[PDB]
Design an enzyme around this catalytic site. Structure first.
Site, mmCIF file in Angstrom:
data_model
loop_
_atom_site.group_PDB
_atom_site.id
_atom_site.type_symbol
_atom_site.label_atom_id
_atom_site.label_comp_id
_atom_site.label_asym_id
_atom_site.label_seq_id
_atom_site.Cartn_x
_atom_site.Cartn_y
_atom_site.Cartn_z
ATOM 1 N N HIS A 87 0.798 -1.198 0.000
ATOM 2 C CA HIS A 87 0.000 0.000 0.000
ATOM 3 C C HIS A 87 0.858 1.288 0.000
ATOM 4 O O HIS A 87 0.918 1.936 0.958
ATOM 5 C CB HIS A 87 -1.021 0.103 1.137
ATOM 6 N N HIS B 243 1.616 4.780 -1.728
ATOM 7 C CA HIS B 243 1.382 5.981 -2.466
ATOM 8 C C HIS B 243 2.716 6.617 -2.911
ATOM 9 O O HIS B 243 3.492 7.041 -2.107
ATOM 10 C CB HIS B 243 0.479 6.988 -1.707
ATOM 11 N N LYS C 267 -6.545 -0.864 -8.670
ATOM 12 C CA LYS C 267 -6.944 -0.265 -7.429
ATOM 13 C C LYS C 267 -8.340 0.432 -7.671
ATOM 14 O O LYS C 267 -8.506 1.186 -8.573
ATOM 15 C CB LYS C 267 -5.949 0.753 -6.951
ATOM 16 N N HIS D 18 -11.000 2.494 -5.651
ATOM 17 C CA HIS D 18 -11.044 3.590 -4.698
ATOM 18 C C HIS D 18 -12.330 4.425 -4.801
ATOM 19 O O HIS D 18 -12.723 4.775 -5.883
ATOM 20 C CB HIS D 18 -9.795 4.575 -4.765
ATOM 21 N N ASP E 145 -12.820 7.609 -4.049
ATOM 22 C CA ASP E 145 -12.377 8.827 -4.654
ATOM 23 C C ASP E 145 -12.513 8.925 -6.150
ATOM 24 O O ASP E 145 -12.848 9.961 -6.629
ATOM 25 C CB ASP E 145 -11.028 9.141 -4.081
ATOM 26 N N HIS F 54 -10.415 -0.014 -1.597
ATOM 27 C CA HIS F 54 -10.793 1.048 -0.688
ATOM 28 C C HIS F 54 -12.289 1.369 -0.923
ATOM 29 O O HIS F 54 -12.666 2.114 -1.811
ATOM 30 C CB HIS F 54 -10.007 2.299 -0.856
ATOM 31 N N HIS G 142 -6.716 -1.295 4.528
ATOM 32 C CA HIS G 142 -7.246 -0.753 5.788
ATOM 33 C C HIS G 142 -8.621 -1.387 6.127
ATOM 34 O O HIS G 142 -9.538 -0.678 6.116
ATOM 35 C CB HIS G 142 -7.273 0.781 5.887
ATOM 36 N N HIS H 189 -9.384 15.388 4.853
ATOM 37 C CA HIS H 189 -10.549 15.749 4.065
ATOM 38 C C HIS H 189 -10.944 17.208 4.236
ATOM 39 O O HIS H 189 -12.111 17.556 4.088
ATOM 40 C CB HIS H 189 -11.745 14.870 4.407
ATOM 41 N N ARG I 73 -16.055 7.492 11.462
ATOM 42 C CA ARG I 73 -14.874 7.078 10.770
ATOM 43 C C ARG I 73 -13.845 6.583 11.752
ATOM 44 O O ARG I 73 -13.145 5.659 11.441
ATOM 45 C CB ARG I 73 -14.390 8.239 9.952
ATOM 46 N N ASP J 101 0.235 2.726 3.604
ATOM 47 C CA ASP J 101 -0.612 3.826 3.170
ATOM 48 C C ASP J 101 0.206 5.143 3.069
ATOM 49 O O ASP J 101 -0.244 6.186 3.471
ATOM 50 C CB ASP J 101 -1.876 3.996 4.044
HETATM 51 NI NI NI Z 1 -7.264 3.616 1.003
HETATM 52 NI NI NI Z 2 -4.246 4.501 0.408
#
Ligand code: NI
Ligand code: NI
Lengths: 100, 132, 564, 100, 100, 66
Positions: free
Chosen positions: C138, C140, C221, C223, C225, C250, C276, C324, C333, C357
């Site tokens: 994971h 980024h 992936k 996601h 988003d 995700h 996660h 966020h 959350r 992450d």
């Molecule tokens: Ni994620």
């Molecule tokens: Ni992530």
């Protein structure tokens, strides 16, 4: 001492805040980098001292005032973030509106 | 004024912004029948929202929420809210979401009948479990 | 003759029955097996055994299978081999043998393939632990410098995505489209870690997925988003099965198109990797954790919730609220109950992998640290796992190790080449001092060369004088850095000539065995219990038993060891 | 000033020991990096001051105690080594079991 | 704080001058690097304090004497140059024959 | 029943049979093209998954006697 990249990087903070604390003590009004330094190290040092994230946060949001900074710097520092090493580990500290 | 703006600040004009003005608005009543919070965004195909939402699903066919781009509406468990709905633009081609349509959501050319692909969609919702 | 253990240990380190403390933890490992006899012990030095015509063969050319490197008298901590004392041998950047090294001319019991010779260099493992290098699933790709932070905690493989600090990368592990993929493949040539790249899964037909597959991704992936829709899932997984690549997810935190149960149904019993799994990092609120019950789900946690501490709730709250740019999304959350639950489930073998992450809520340089930190907090709270042996913590330790080593590999279809200290595998290895286990390694061995190490003053008369800090080495230099590093790709891509097309000098290796795997193929973390979450109080029940533990005040391997 | 790599590297030591000396003076028990810093700089500064290798060695083996460090740190610091610049040149200083 | 290469580089100066000022205060006679550090930072700090180039120049040409340095160092430091950030911007400061 | 064995249903006879779930991933492709997917229970005790109800409906109108 087997210094990792994260450890080495943090030396920059310590060096700039020492300069910054000397300047503030001469009565100089601080700039952006300098001010960010002082808030950052305050947190970091709290962490080391054994405080909570909650508690360091307060502490750091109170170290600098409007008077102590150059006009406008506040607008440049809405929040400060740093990772510090707390008793329970590395943790992110956000400090909200530190220059009040 | 200019003398008062912070560093990098904006001086905004007064005139409000008007959006989605041309578009016909359908109000639907939405009840969350699940135990968990449901939140839906501006561009989601309202028709295809969480099975647990109970509303007039037929009325949401080809529709989105008439809210600000990028914003959302929160439907807490066991609450009822009225929501404004508006049609999608462009070609009215909706692919993906819950695989209820995977096509054209337009009205077509005949006022006071429904297209059959719409009725298909609506039937399919019903038996996939999408509450009406 | 007869020698005391204490004297033996001092010469050669610990043998069968001897126990080693892993740092400042309360974990004690025990040597199960000693593969390297007694009385013919291979050690490098002046006046020692690995000299010409004695322990070292002096007449054999390299094509007789003489080693390129030997690691001597080392304690191997591996999820498949266990806790053993052995000589380890490397040839052609591969593990040739684990056993007794030397010269069969003058020595009995030399393991075949472990002939030390004219070709051989040496590493003294006497007082050391050898691990497989970790694998971070994971990542980024926000900052190239992450690689350095990773190597410095014993991680040498990255799976993820991005394109540097774009808003899309800041939030997701996606390298979108064939242009961006090509670019990113080319870039990573400059990095001293293995890499595989993930693509954007949110697509309606086959076209846009296939594109990226051929361009070279190892995965897709999915996601929120970019849309974590049923559609996305379904098409991503169908393609995956076609391409023999993985899918990571995700899930929808807002419950917009569905609840967790609907997500589950979108998986359509197909193999999937769930990031996660707890939800603090994203996912169907409050109850994404229930996916850990399913046989098709290969579950992971991100590392900021592990271990569970007293500052954990404060941190996470505030983090999202900035992540966020933001309160009822927040406190839904960030759930103390499920965070504790994550910790327990780890200890049970129900969550199968750790991950970072990186610079999207977790810590790229803390996976080996946190793993150990968790094992130790959990021993304290729960005691011995039932399968532990009374005198030692092997069962436990080994569960945890699987989490950052073999399990990630299996998930991404690279266990054939990496993730365990086993014969025929790429030598992607880490050496540790027990005193520093998990925290601060000695070195990283990357494709059979030392790429990264703790090194002091290059001007000094020794390698140990201060300041000691992590530095690249020769494997990290020149054309060798590419030679010794792998870029993982799709078979589709491999077959289409990605290596030529993209002009890659890295080793280019096809991922394989991603789609036939299940939870039960995972090593020491193969449990599928019933998981229930209370939609009011967020309380977790695992086969009807409340799954909680109390937060730690003090972490091990923590403020003692680190200035950071 | 024409700083060489060896010269620049030594600035890290100076920065970490300043932090470390501040912490010790607050009554904080030192960690591994910090403790190694203080012993290292003690030597280094001795060298500069004109002492012998023998003499600096003693000095550095006496700056920190068990009390002054966090439990276990001793086990982490069996010896400390640094190259310092003595009157007669650069020389290696080993400091044996510095935390007594 | 968005530190630029020029900003980061200047941390070296601050670190070496802190060491140098500590040494001078112990009565140590300074070497070349150390002496250059002290003159450099004097200028730099003046700049920050709001002085003119002219004024900082004077100030920096007066901080160190022959007595304060090791024999010969003068010959090694004919001039010192640094760019500092004055109220009107970045400016080059040359300090002529600073060790008198 | 035993792997590889079978049960014979002669015309106009009635037999009780024991049934058990499939293992592994519970992914069933082919046969009469009634499912061509996942046959698991999923995560919600005291409801049916909709793809199951779809399947069951489809059986009914393809002529599969219940
Ligand atoms: Ni994620
Ligand atoms: Ni992530």
């Amino acid at each position: 001492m087997q210094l990792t990249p994260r450890e080495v990087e943090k030396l920059m903070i310590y060096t700039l805040s020492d300069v910054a604390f000397k300047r503030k003590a001469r009565g100089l009004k601080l700039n952006y980098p300098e001010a960010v330094s002082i808030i950052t190290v305050t947190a970091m040092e709290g962490a080391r001292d054994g405080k909570s994230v909650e508690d360091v946060m307060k502490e750091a949001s109170k170290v600098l005032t409007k008077d102590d900074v150059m006009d406008g710097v506040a607008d440049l520092i809405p929040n400060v973030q740093v990772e510090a090493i707390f008793t329970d580990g590395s943790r992110l500290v956000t400090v909200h509106d530190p220059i009040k | 004024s200019e003398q008062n703006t912070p560093l990098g600040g904006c001086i905004l004009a007064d005139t409000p912004i008007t959006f989605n003005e041309n578009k016909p608005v359908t109000k639907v009543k939405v009840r969350n029948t699940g135990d968990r919070p449901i939140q839906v965004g501006s561009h989601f195909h309202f028709f295809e929202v969480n099975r647990a939402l109970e509303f007039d699903r037929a009325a949401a066919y080809g529709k989105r929420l008439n809210i600000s781009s990028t914003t959302a509406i929160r439907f807490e468990p066991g609450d009822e809210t009225e929501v404004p709905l508006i049609p999608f633009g462009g070609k009215q081609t909706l692919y993906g979401f819950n695989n209820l349509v995977d096509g054209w959501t337009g009205e077509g050319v005949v006022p006071n009948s429904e297209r059959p692909d719409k009725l298909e969609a609506i039937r399919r919702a019903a038996e996939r479990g999408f509450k009406s | 003759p007869q020698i005391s253990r204490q004297e033996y240990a001092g010469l050669f380190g610990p043998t069968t029955g001897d126990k080693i403390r892993l740092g400042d933890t309360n974990l004690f490992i025990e040597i199960e097996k000693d593969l390297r006899g007694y009385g013919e012990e291979s050690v490098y030095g002046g006046g020692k055994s690995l000299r010409d015509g004695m322990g070292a063969n002096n007449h054999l050319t390299r094509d007789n299978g003489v080693l390129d490197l030997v690691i001597t008298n080392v304690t191997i901590v591996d999820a498949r081999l266990g806790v053993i004392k052995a000589d380890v041998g490397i040839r052609d950047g591969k593990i040739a043998g684990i056993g007794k090294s030397g010269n069969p001319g003058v020595m009995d019991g030399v393991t075949p393939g472990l002939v030390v010779g004219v070709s051989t260099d040496a590493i003294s493992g006497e007082h050391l632990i050898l691990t497989a290098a970790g694998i971070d699933t994971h990542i980024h790709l926000i900052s190239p410098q992450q690689a350095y932070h990773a190597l410095s905690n014993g991680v040498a493989t990255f799976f993820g995505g991005g394109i540097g600090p774009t808003d899309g990368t800041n939030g997701t592990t996606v390298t979108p489209g064939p242009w961006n993929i090509r670019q990113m493949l080319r870039s990573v040539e400059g990095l001293p870690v293995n890499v595989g790249i993930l693509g954007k899964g949110n697509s309606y037909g086959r076209g846009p997925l296939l594109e990226q597959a051929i361009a070279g991704v190892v995965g897709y992936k999915v996601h929120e988003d970019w849309g974590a829709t049923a559609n996305a899932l379904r098409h991503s997984l169908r393609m995956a099965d076609e391409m023999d690549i993985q899918v990571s997810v995700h899930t929808d935190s807002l419950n917009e198109c569905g609840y967790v149960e609907d997500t589950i149904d979108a998986f359509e019993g197909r193999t999937i990797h769930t990031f996660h799994t707890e939800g603090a990092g994203g996912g169907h609120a409050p109850d994404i954790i229930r996916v850990a019950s399913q046989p098709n789900v290969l579950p992971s946690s991100t590392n900021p919730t592990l271990p569970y501490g007293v500052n954990s709730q404060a941190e996470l709250f505030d983090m999202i609220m900035v992540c966020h740019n933001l309160v009822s999304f927040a406190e839904s959350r960030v759930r103390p109950e499920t965070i504790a639950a994550e910790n327990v489930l780890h200890d049970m073998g129900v969550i199968s992998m750790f991950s970072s992450d990186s610079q999207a809520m977790g810590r790229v340089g803390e996976n080996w640290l946190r793993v150990m930190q968790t094992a130790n907090a959990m021993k304290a709270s729960r005691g011995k796992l039932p399968e532990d042996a009374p005198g030692n913590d092997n069962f436990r330790v080994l569960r945890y190790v699987a989490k950052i080593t073999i399990n990630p590999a299996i998930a991404q279809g690279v266990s054939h080449v990496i993730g365990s200290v086993e014969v025929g595998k790429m030598a992607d290895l880490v050496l540790w001092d027990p005193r520093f286990f998990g925290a601060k390694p000695k070195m990283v061995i990357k494709g059979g060369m030392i790429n990264w190490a703790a090194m002091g003053d290059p001007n000094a008369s020794l390698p140990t004088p201060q300041p000691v800090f992590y530095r690249p080495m020769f494997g990290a230099m020149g054309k060798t850095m590419q030679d010794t590093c792998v870029t993982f790709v799709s078979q589709a891509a491999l077959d289409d000539g990605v290596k030529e097309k993209a002009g890659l000098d890295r080793q280019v290796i096809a991922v394989k065995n991603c789609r036939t795997i299940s939870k039960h193929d995972l090593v020491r973390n193969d449990q599928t219990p019933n998981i229930e979450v209370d939609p009011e109080t967020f309380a977790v029940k695992v086969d009807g038993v409340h799954a909680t533990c109390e937060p730690i005040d003090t972490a091990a391997m923590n403020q003692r060891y680190f200035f950071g």
